[PDB]
């Protein structure tokens, strides 16, 4: 079907790397994190690859994919066979000459000396997890590969009125039972029917001092004499990246409907009236 908000014009592309197998931000975190400071994220281990030419994007590519139709002298077309299976890659033109930019291109520094970066002869093993985030509009199509081999795509480019650049090709390789790579966007892939709601029960009103965890992070605690606005302010004050304005909470007397940008569950339970005010189900 046609979707005017799934049409994409990549405006800027951030690129991050980490040790092999490192997990990317989940689809619901990718809408809330900032892209400029990876040391702030929940998924520690990622860091920015460096500056990239800001009129250009990470250049996807492949080689192989050479495929042709085959048959028998009875029936002339019956399969298309892929003769050389697709080897899939992305090219990244760093413009930095910092050590942490050269290590993507040359592999690890071979000298201990302050102020020198040394290169040895022969091939190097150099492979990383790779996360790319492509930004347009308020969209953030992420891309994640758990293992990519990094190699020099071409020699270092220097020019008298265009920035110096050192291009790496990251080639994707499969790793354990995981996928070759994954695209990350919560609105587009495996999407639910639009609303989700959690029903916080209230029938156990003899009560106590229970609490919620929201996206895994605690709200402190809430007393049994609860109110829809009071629990919206409690949930909306969890320090997780998203404000009280994003949450919708309403009542049907015996329970509250809770809804918003993140998962909600009960943490520590404390109540006299059995399960009746410590139930939170979808």
């Amino acid at each position: 079907a046609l979707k005017d908000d799934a049409v994409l014009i990549a405006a800027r592309g951030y690129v991050y790397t980490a040790a092999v197998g490192t997990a990317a931000p989940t689809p619901s975190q990718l809408k809330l994190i900032d892209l400029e400071h990876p040391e702030a994220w929940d998924r520690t281990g990622w860091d920015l690859v460096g500056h990239t030419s800001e009129d250009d994007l990470p250049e996807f590519g492949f080689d192989g994919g050479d495929s042709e139709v085959r048959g028998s002298w009875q029936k002339k077309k019956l399969r298309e066979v892929e003769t050389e299976e697709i080897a899939d890659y992305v090219v990244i033109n760093l413009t930095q000459f910092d050590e942490t930019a050269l290590e993507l291109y040359f592999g690890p520094n071979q000298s201990a000396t302050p102020g020198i970066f040394g290169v040895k002869s022969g091939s190097v093993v150099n492979e990383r997890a790779l996360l790319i985030v492509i930004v347009d509009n308020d969209v953030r199509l992420g891309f994640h590969a758990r293992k990519a081999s990094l190699k020099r795509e071409d020699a270092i480019s220097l020019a008298t009125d265009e920035f110096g650049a050192l291009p790496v090709r990251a080639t994707f390789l499969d790793y354990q039972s995981y996928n070759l790579y994954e695209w990350i966007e919560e609105d587009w892939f495996n999407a639910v029917d639009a609303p989700v709601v959690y029903l916080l029960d209230l029938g156990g009103a003899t009560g106590g001092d229970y609490t919620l965890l929201v996206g895994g992070k605690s709200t402190g605690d809430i007393a049994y004499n609860a109110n829809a606005s009071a629990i919206k302010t409690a949930i909306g004050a969890v320090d997780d990246g998203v404000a009280e304005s994003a949450w919708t909470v309403t009542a049907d007397g015996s329970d509250f409907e809770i809804s918003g940008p993140l998962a909600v569950a009960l943490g520590v339970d404390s109540t006299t009236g059995g399960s009746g005010v410590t139930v939170d189900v979808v």
Binding site: D4, V7, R12, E54, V135, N137
Partner: protein
């Protein structure tokens, strides 16, 4: 997706620093107090410094005319102070447009997608008594306001 805006409903909130369209005085700290508009007021009303942004070309994109557009805006800075202050005020306007593009800045009318110069800041003659003009053409990309 909503309709694409006229270019003034996106560029002006970026240069002014607020999305109240009724109030032309900027609050962005690099060029605060500059009057930013599309049409120069009567001599009994106008105040300098002044920035004028004026649509001078640029089509919808041919790929999808209703999804992305690339207006060309002639941007012009005027002052009664001196030529260097008029240059620095134009530079301080590019430094805001390039930052607002780097973030994909949202406005009620649309998103500023990208900014590029098709003719850089240049000195010229001014039509107003004892003032200096500096001007150039920016081509800037716009996207619909979701919804």
């Amino acid at each position: 997706a909503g309709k694409l805006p006229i270019v003034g409903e996106v560029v002006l909130p970026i240069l002014r620093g607020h999305e109240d369209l009724s109030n032309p005085i900027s609050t962005v700290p690099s060029l605060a107090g500059v009057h930013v508009g599309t049409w120069v007021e009567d001599i009994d009303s106008r105040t300098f410094p002044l920035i004028t942004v004026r649509r001078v070309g640029g089509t919808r994109s041919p790929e999808h005319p209703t999804l992305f557009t690339q207006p060309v805006v002639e941007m012009t800075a005027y002052s009664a102070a001196d030529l260097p202050t008029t240059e620095q005020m134009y530079e301080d306007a590019l430094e805001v447009l390039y930052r607002a593009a780097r973030l994909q800045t949202k406005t009620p009318a649309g998103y500023l997608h990208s900014v590029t110069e098709t003719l850089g800041a240049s000195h010229g003659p001014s039509p107003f008594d004892r003032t200096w003009r500096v001007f150039g053409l920016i081509r800037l990309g716009i996207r619909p306001p979701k919804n």
